[PDB]
A = this chain, B = another copy of it.
Amino acid sequence: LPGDFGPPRGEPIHAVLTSPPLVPPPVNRTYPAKVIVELEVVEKEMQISEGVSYTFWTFGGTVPGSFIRVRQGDTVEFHLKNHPSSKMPHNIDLHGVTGPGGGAASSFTAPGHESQFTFKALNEGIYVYHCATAPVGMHIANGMYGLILVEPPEGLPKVDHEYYVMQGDFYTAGKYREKGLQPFDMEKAIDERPSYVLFNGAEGALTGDKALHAKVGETVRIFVGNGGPNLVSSFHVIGAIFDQVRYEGGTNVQKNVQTTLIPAGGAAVVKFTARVPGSYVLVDHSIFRAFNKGAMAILKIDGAENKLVYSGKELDSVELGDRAAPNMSAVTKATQASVSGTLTVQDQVQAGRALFAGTCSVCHQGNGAGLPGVFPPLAKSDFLAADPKRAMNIVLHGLNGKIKVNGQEYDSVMPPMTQLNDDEVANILTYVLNSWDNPGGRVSAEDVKKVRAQPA
């Protein structure tokens, strides 16, 4: 058969699996081997967004699951353990496996059990693996997917960096950024109406202090999966071009494209050469996913400017919003303090500072100064101080028509921002009230809930 290089030789190899966004070393081998893969399913609560918990079902404790790297022609002895704390049974289907279910019917594993099966890796390429346990959609939606690379016999060309990025669509009972432990929502999942669309299992998984890194002149290979369960990614890099895009083990290689479609369950290898420094954004260019549901990752390039190629500046909160900053840990802290009943004004101020970036600063500026006669100030604002309840109604329901702020007329339009949750409005307004010589005090989530329930 194609990809059959005879029986395993050398010694059995225990596969080294890596957590996203890292990749195991190149196999660097000229002979087929028996490769033993041990992967454990863990069900666990993790933060899908700041102050938002979700019960993920994982291969190896992460979303996506542990990266597996083997060579075409290898005999793979696959061990699937299900942690005793699990409530559900699980299995695995690996794309690129030649056999019914890609392993599913020989990997069915109850909590506290282990299964094994063996396959020959006949098909070179990058492949999605996922759980295949009824109801399959629920298992994939909860995070049960990852990538397996089957290298060609001669290996992939050498690059400076290899990274592991996987998109998924997620379905919570609550709205986007609604705090608390969020249940899986079967109705949204069947309707293909996700609340979150993420790289690597969380908002901000690959932004700020968790960005991917390279230097000017270096090559970067990214193994890009789409776990779905339902969405097709218009996968794109802002401000750069892919030297190459190869899907699964396909013979076709596209070169010099910026935007590529990755099917649900699909995988691609992309290659990038870093030319000028700054932040390069990976997005799903179905744009509300990227900028309203979490589908943004950063590759930060360090090194010398080249003004002959690009004269301009690094991104900030205008483009990246509240993900320009290293993290939003203050939001997590304020949500934990609300639960404990120890929420301070300063907890709200720091959370609001984080959330004000982009969301409000695009028009009002990072210092609240606005732009005289165009965008009114929030700094030392008489209009704000005069009526904090009115300010709650402005954030939720918008504002238009002639107003006077700090002695100047404005005649413009502030769009409604109803998608902000009650805690987010409360924290942003508490931040503004405690900044820039404003009168202090605080707005509570309960205050905003009342205004939302009866607009002015």
Residues of chain A touching chain B, judged by Cβ–Cβ distance below 8 Å, are 1, 75, 87-89, 91, 93, 95-108, 110-112, 117-120, 122-125, 127-128, 132-138, 140, 176, 184, 186-187, 189-193, 228-232, 234, 236, 238-241, 247-252, 254-261, 263-266, 275-276, 278-281, 285-293, 307-319, 321, 358-359, 362-363, 371, 374-375, 412-413, 415-416, 418-419
Partner of A257, one of B238, B249, B374: B249
A309 to chain B, nearest CB (A): 5
A322 to chain B, nearest CB (A): 9
A135 to chain B, nearest CB (A): 6
Q: A259-B95, A265-B287 are in contact. Are A238 and B1 (CB under 8 A)?
A: no
Contacts of A315 on B, CB cut-off 8 Å?
Answer: 100-101, 104-105
Q: How far is the CA of A1 from the CA of B137 in the complex (A)?
A: 46
- Whether A359 contacts B134 by the Cβ 8 Å rule is yes
A100 to chain B, nearest CB (A): 3
- Whether A418 contacts B186 by the Cβ 8 Å rule is yes
Apart from A91-B319, A101-B279, A232-B232, what 18 extra A-B contacts exist at CB < 8 Å?
A1-B309, A93-B238, A99-B276, A104-B238, A108-B318, A110-B375, A112-B374, A120-B308, A120-B310, A127-B258, A134-B321, A134-B362, A229-B286, A232-B286, A241-B249, A249-B257, A251-B255, A264-B285
- Whether A312 contacts B241 by the Cβ 8 Å rule is no
The residue of chain B having its C-beta at the shortest distance from the C-beta of A289 within the complex is B230
Q: Which of A230, A288, A293, A412 has the most CB of B within 10 A?
A: A288
Contacts of A287 on B, CB cut-off 8 Å?
Answer: 136-137, 140, 228-230, 264-265
Q: Number of copies of this chain in the oligomer?
A: 3
The 5 closest A-B CB pairs, nearest first, are A99-B310, A106-B312, A100-B278, A265-B285, A234-B263
- Whether B286 contacts A264 by the Cβ 8 Å rule is yes
Contacts of A135 on B, CB cut-off 8 Å?
Answer: 291-292
- Whether B309 contacts A96 by the Cβ 8 Å rule is no
Q: How far is the CA of A75 from the CA of B119 in the complex (A)?
A: 51
Q: A101-B239, A286-B192 are in contact. Are A254 and B250 (CB under 8 A)?
A: yes
28 A–B contacts, CB within 8 A, in A order: A87-B413, A89-B375, A97-B310, A99-B312, A100-B278, A100-B279, A104-B318, A105-B319, A110-B371, A110-B374, A112-B374, A117-B311, A118-B310, A118-B312, A132-B238, A132-B319, A134-B319, A136-B287, A190-B293, A228-B234, A247-B257, A248-B259, A249-B256, A249-B257, A250-B256, A250-B257, A252-B254, A264-B286
Q: Which of A120, A232, A311 has the most CB of B within 10 A?
A: A311
- Whether B251 contacts A254 by the Cβ 8 Å rule is yes
- Whether A239 contacts B112 by the Cβ 8 Å rule is no
The residue of chain B having its C-beta at the shortest distance from the C-beta of A287 within the complex is B229
The residue of chain B having its C-beta at the shortest distance from the C-beta of A233 within the complex is B263
A5 to chain B, nearest CB (A): 12
Q: How far is the CA of A134 from the CA of B315 in the complex (A)?
A: 12
Contacts of A310 on B, CB cut-off 8 Å?
Answer: 97-100, 117-120
Q: How far is the CA of A126 from the CA of B105 in the complex (A)?
A: 35
